[PDB]
Amino acid sequence: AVQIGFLLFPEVQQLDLTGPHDVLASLPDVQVHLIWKEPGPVVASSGLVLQATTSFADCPPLDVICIPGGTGVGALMEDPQALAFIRQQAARARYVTSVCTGSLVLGAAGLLQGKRATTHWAYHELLAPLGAIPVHERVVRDGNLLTGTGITAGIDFALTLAAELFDAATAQRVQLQLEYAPAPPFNAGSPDTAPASVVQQARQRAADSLHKRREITLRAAARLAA
Amino acid sequence: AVQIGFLLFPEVQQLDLTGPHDVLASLPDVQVHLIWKEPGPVVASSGLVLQATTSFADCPPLDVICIPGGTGVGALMEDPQALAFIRQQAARARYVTSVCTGSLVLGAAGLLQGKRATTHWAYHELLAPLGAIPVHERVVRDGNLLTGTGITAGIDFALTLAAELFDAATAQRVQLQLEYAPAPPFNAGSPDTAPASVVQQARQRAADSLHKRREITLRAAARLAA
Ligand SMILES: [Cl-]
Ligand SMILES: [Cl-]
């Protein structure tokens, strides 16, 4: 059975995780894990309560690891237990993946050094200090690393992983069973397509978070420099 | 504060719910409820454990009600307590909405009689016996009713509801903050675009469920005829 694991942490952006979870859990011969320091309730940034199913110590070797993003990424970038777990699993995983600001956690773990990668548009400047080659594309692959932008990045890349773990017909069948054919009613999902006034509002609302994450990123980079 | 409620039931398809939940929970001056017979753990069809936050009796009057789909829809179509709650809330709600097979629950509650509506492609034949005018479109509006197809229907229609409850700039800002710009790697999300061999596989896998739901639908229709 293919072993797929998602890191589940306080103040996660739950859709980053729950989207790919439902897609991948639809495949045959997969087992999906929700990993934290111990099993039990973990609260997402919206207040939605999720349950972790396994601890770091009990998690099996994973074929796919996925790091979601969210407010809670700042704490995780300086959590030595979580970073060590990610490094251990990434060494043997077939696919190391992240959604949105989850790539900043991969960066803090040292896994983006010399690698092409993306992250959420408002935090993209934080990739270079973590050793990455920043790329402004929605899905960036470098070897077995796959970083994606957008809250639903993992739904799309889950279909790619289904096709590569199984076959194209299997991925197509899952897509049809889920009737997955998005059609957003607005075209403001990128700073290059949204109105300038909207981009300003969004940048202003992210400013305090970006400032705090600049500080965290520099400490994380210092640890990598040692 | 705008009151938004999702019905959370055993064997729900969790993404039908968790997608719109995360989008709508990003708006100012909203309160989002996860409703079941009592607060506490409810298990989705994938095994993911979610928590209901309020009971039927304690739920406030809702401005928006949303019914997700999933395996568990069959039981809900013959749950008199759930159907009565949906009818009570729908009487005064500004928006009555559903995702995928959630519209079959609205049908069992009598809320599709004479109304245009859609549902999941494999179960679409069940709409007419519940009194609906079946429409093969991804999002169908009829008055204050909005039914949508696809596991992520609620992400898209949540942006429409944001624009109508607040304004377009607010919906655009949420879309940009979430960097929401999907791009599926396959084009098999409709029976009209998927390969015929894939459609066959998917139809064969749904056949037992469709058979059971034909029986349930006829009993539900008999109750509406009384
Ligand atoms: Cl997206
Ligand atoms: Cl969809």
Which tokens go with A148?
A: 């994606």
B101 and B119 Cβ atoms separated by less than 8 Å: yes
Q: Is A138 left (phi over 0), alpha (psi -120 to 50) or beta?
A: alpha
B42 and B72 Cβ atoms separated by less than 8 Å: no
B23, closest residue in chain A (CA to CA): A15
Residues in chain A: 226
Give residues with Cβ within 8 angstroms of B48, minimum separation 6.
A18, A21, A22, A25, A34, A50, A51, B14
Tally of CB atoms within 10 A around B211? 9
The answer to whether B207 contacts chain A (CB < 8 Å) is no
Rounded-to-integer distance, Cα B133 and Cα B147, Å? 12
**A:B CB pairs within 8 Å:** 209
Rounded-to-integer distance, Cα B200 and Cα A173, Å? 10
The answer to whether B194 contacts chain A (CB < 8 Å) is yes
Distance of CA B48 to the CA centre of its chain: 18
B197, closest residue in chain A (CA to CA): A169
Q: Name residue, tokens 């796959």.
A: A146
Tally of CB atoms within 10 A around A29? 8
Which residues of A are part of the catalytic machinery?
A: 100
Rounded-to-integer distance, Cα A64 and Cα A183, Å? 28
Task: Reply yes or no on whether B100 is catalytic.
Answer: yes
Phi, psi of B197 (to 5 degrees): -65, -35
Residues of A in contact with B183 (CB under 8 A): 138, 156
Rounded-to-integer distance, Cα A7 and Cα B214, Å? 40
B167: three-class secondary structure by DSSP: coil
A138 and B167 Cβ atoms separated by less than 8 Å: no
Rounded-to-integer distance, Cα B96 and Cα B168, Å? 20
Rounded-to-integer distance, Cα A86 and Cα A90, Å? 6
Checking chain B for breaks where C and the next N are over 2.5 Å apart, the residues before them are none
Options B100, B111, B145, B146, the catalytic residue = B100
Domain A1-226 bears CATH identifier 3.40.630.10: no
Checking chain A for breaks where C and the next N are over 2.5 Å apart, the residues before them are none
Q: Name residue, tokens 């307590």.
A: B81
Amino acid identity at A99: V
Could B185 and A160 be called an inter-chain contact, meaning their C-beta atoms sit closer than 8 Å?
A: yes
CA-nearest of A131, A177, A121 to B181 is A121
Rounded-to-integer distance, Cα A17 and Cα A114, Å? 26
A56: three-class secondary structure by DSSP: coil
Give residues with Cβ within 8 angstroms of B148, minimum separation 6.
B97, B98, B99, B100, B118, B138, B139, B140, B154, B156, B157
Residues of A in contact with B175 (CB under 8 A): 184, 186, 188-189, 194
Q: Which residue among B149, B172, B185 sits closest to A195, beta carbon to beta carbon?
A: B172
| A57-69 core/surface letters (b: 16 or more CB in 10 A; e: else) | eebeebbbbbbbb
How close is the Cα of A28 to the center of ligand 1, in Å? Answer: 25
Tally of CB atoms within 10 A around A41? 14
Sign of the Cα torsion A69, B2, B85, B53 reads: positive
Tally of CB atoms within 10 A around A204? 9
Q: Which helix (H) or strand (E) holds B90?
A: helix B80-92
Q: Is A119 left (phi over 0), alpha (psi -120 to 50) or beta?
A: beta
A12 and A101 Cβ atoms separated by less than 8 Å: no
Resolution (A): 1.1
Instruction: Tell me B70's DSSP state.
Output: S
Amino acid identity at A98: S
The answer to whether B113 contacts chain A (CB < 8 Å) is no
CA-nearest of A18, A184, A25, A97 to B183 is A184
Give residues with Cβ within 8 angstroms of B53, minimum separation 6.
B33, B34, B35, B39
The answer to whether B159 contacts chain A (CB < 8 Å) is yes
How close is the Cα of A197 to the center of ligand 2, in Å? Answer: 29
Interface of A with B in 54-83 (CB under 8 A): none
Could B195 and A169 be called an inter-chain contact, meaning their C-beta atoms sit closer than 8 Å?
A: yes
CA-nearest of A51, A140, A130, A61 to A100 is A140
Interface of B with A in 126-155 (CB under 8 A): 138, 149-152, 155
CA-nearest of B23, B48, B154 to A26 is B48
Tally of CB atoms within 10 A around A80? 8
B191, closest residue in chain A (CA to CA): A176
Rounded-to-integer distance, Cα A8 and Cα A44, Å? 9
How many degrees, rounded to 5, is the angle at CA B214 between CA B209 and CA B216?
95
Experimental method: X-ray
Antiparallel, parallel or unpaired: β A145-148 and A139-142: antiparallel
DSSP code per residue over A128-190:
GGGT-EE--SSEEEETTEEEE-STTHHHHHHHHHHHHHS-HHHHHHHHHHTT-----S---SS
Tally of CB atoms within 10 A around B142? 16
Q: Which helix (H) or strand (E) holds A35?
A: strand A30-36
A93 and A65 Cβ atoms separated by less than 8 Å: yes
Residues of A in contact with B184 (CB under 8 A): 155-156, 159, 175, 180-182
